[PDB]
Design a protein around this ligand. Sequence first.
Ligand SMILES: Nc1nc2c(ncn2[C@@H]2O[C@H](CO)[C@@H](O)[C@@H]2OP(=O)(O)O)c(=O)[nH]1
Ligand code: NA
Ligand code: NA
Length: 104
Amino acid sequence: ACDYTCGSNCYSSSDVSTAQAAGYQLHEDGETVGSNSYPHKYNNYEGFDFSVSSPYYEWPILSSGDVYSGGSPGADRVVFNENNQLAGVITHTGASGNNFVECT
Ligand SMILES: Nc1nc2c(ncn2[C@@H]2O[C@H](CO)[C@@H](O)[C@@H]2OP(=O)(O)O)c(=O)[nH]1
Ligand code: NA
Ligand code: NA
């Protein structure tokens, strides 16, 4: 039962909660991991209608169930704000160029 579906990936919100929590922790600390330095600001160039207030930050969500720990970010991301609220779940899967679509 998919709370969020990114392409073929099935995410529950515990799955989300867990990804989120780690990214949020590193955001707060002023540190990043990976060659892409996650977490980092998500601009919302795509213009998604998130309810949550900005600034937004993106952190990879792993199809593997595993919390991102520095390798490939994959195509999926968790977006959260400074108050640590979940903004949405987006993915490169299904989007053209280097844009993102929302996970459903
Ligand atoms: N598609 C997309 N990429 C973003 C967004 N915010 C930040 N980024 C991207 O994240 C990377 C690290 O900041 C950059 O390649 C890229 O931004 P740029 O196009 O602005 O350079 C956004 O809202 N959408
Ligand atoms: Na730093
Ligand atoms: Na392409």
